[PDB]
């Protein structure tokens, strides 16, 4: 069957957020066996609640469970940075289980994290293959919005730019990457190339040179 869950939830640091989990009379509203799971990016799920409101060992008191009719709820008080994750509910349904759709929990209004930028020139092996790529890497930043700007010396680059979408890594922080594609002759034509990373009003710039 289908267990309805809102796609996204949000709450500020220290506040509370309730994540609903709606089923029918044959699963959520038919038994007191609702479970809740937390999943950080890149890692296996973790059991947070079982039997509607029971907490295993290792789960803080901030997570609490409740149920009312066909709707089970997970409340997270005193929201913290590490609570940002995906949350799925589970329910028994008669020799079968069923999960909810899942809810992404964003913890709003936390201290920012400055990105660490690293720019790589084209390798000699790629240049020998008559290709050239500039690899700009951006990691350990929060929140996830970031603009990446490429520059040939001081002027903006014309074309050949590819940029990832910022996605959270295993440390629960965001990371992205941008690729500037050039011919070997374009690479050796300009004095320097720059990756400009704008994040939350602050701008970082890394620069490489074909001579240096």
């Amino acid at each position: 069957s289908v267990v309805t869950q809102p796609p996204s939830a949000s709450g500020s640091l220290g506040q509370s957020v309730t994540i609903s989990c709606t089923g029918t009379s044959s699963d959520v509203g038919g038994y007191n066996y609702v479970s809740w799971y937390q999943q950080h990016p890149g890692k296996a799920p973790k059991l947070m609640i079982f039997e509607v409101s029971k907490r295993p060992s290792g789960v803080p008191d901030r997570f609490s469970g409740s149920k009312s009719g066909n709707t089970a709820s997970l409340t997270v008080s005193g929201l913290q940075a590490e609570d940002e994750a995906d949350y799925y509910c589970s329910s028994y349904a008669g020799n079968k289980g069923v999960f909810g759709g899942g809810t992404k929990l964003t913890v709003l209004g936390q201290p920012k994290a400055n990105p660490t930028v690293t720019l790589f020139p084209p390798s000699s092996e790629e240049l020998q293959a008559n290709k050239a790529t500039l690899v700009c890497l951006i990691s350990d930043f929060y929140p996830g919005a970031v603009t990446v700007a490429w520059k040939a010396d001081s002027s903006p680059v014309k074309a050949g730019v590819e940029t990832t979408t910022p996605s959270k890594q295993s440390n629960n922080k965001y990371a992205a990457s941008s690729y500037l594609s050039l011919t070997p002759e374009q690479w050796k034509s300009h004095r320097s190339y720059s990756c400009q990373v704008t994040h939350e009003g602050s701008t970082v710039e890394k620069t490489v040179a074909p001579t240096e």
């Binding site: 869950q5 295993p56 079968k96 289980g97 999960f99 790589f120 790629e126 990832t164």
Partner: protein, 223 residues
């Protein structure tokens, strides 16, 4: 410690077959019921199948009923899932999970406390192109080095360092789907500077679609 490890993933065409395995350790596999749960990209968790300790109780989801075949070998402490006639919607991340108590439905009663790392399964009829691997050399008290996994199709690629022994300081990044229709990826490790002439750093790129396995030694540039 308790531990579950899934194996047997990869890309396979719609209609073909694929068998998954789950190796268990750290707990009495003889008595517990184990289950399969998958995570489809963009969707959430979805229960796949379940099997009791003696295989006396077996259940499947309606989407894979008469399609998958679950089994186990208690002597080898291994769980299996034979997936035949795979469809595009079968593309997911398959998890091996044990229950809190050895009963069949007890994993639903008290939750699934132990999960494996999962094995990726892709079901698409797409074409295949192997990646070119180039080293991102560092400048000879830390330094950043990596390698460039360029122009491959389709997803995904796995990048380890030093056959998996190098995990600390390894930075992970997502792939670009470039305007050419090909993906590109880069992996980077941060290491102390005083070890560039001492240690050896090798990135292990595995692109199973193309059967491409490259080991590239990344070493400092000679300016």
């Amino acid at each position: 410690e308790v531990q579950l490890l899934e194996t047997g993933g990869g890309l396979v065409q719609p209609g073909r077959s694929l068998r998954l395995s789950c190796a268990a350790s750290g707990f009495p596999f003889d008595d517990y019921a184990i289950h399969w749960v998958r995570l489809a990209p963009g969707k959430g968790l979805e229960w796949v199948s379940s099997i009791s300790w003696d295989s006396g109780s077996i259940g499947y989801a309606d989407s894979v009923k008469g399609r998958f075949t679950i089994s186990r070998d208690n002597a080898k402490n291994s769980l299996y899932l034979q997936m035949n006639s795979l469809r595009a919607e079968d593309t997911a991340l398959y998890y091996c999970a044990k229950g809190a108590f050895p009963g069949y439905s007890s994993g639903w009663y008290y939750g699934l406390d132990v999960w494996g790392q999962g094995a990726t399964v892709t079901v698409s009829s797409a074409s295949t192109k192997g990646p070119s691997v180039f080293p991102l050399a560092p400048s000879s008290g830390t330094a950043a080095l990596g390698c460039l996994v360029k122009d491959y199709f389709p997803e995904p690629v796995t990048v380890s360092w030093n056959s998996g022994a190098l995990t600390s300081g390894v930075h992970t990044f997502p792939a670009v789907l470039q305007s050419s229709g090909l993906y590109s990826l880069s992996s980077v490790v941060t290491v102390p500077s005083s070890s560039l002439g001492t240690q050896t750093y090798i990135c292990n790129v595995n692109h199973k679609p193309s059967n491409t396995k490259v080991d590239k030694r990344v070493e400092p540039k000679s300016c």
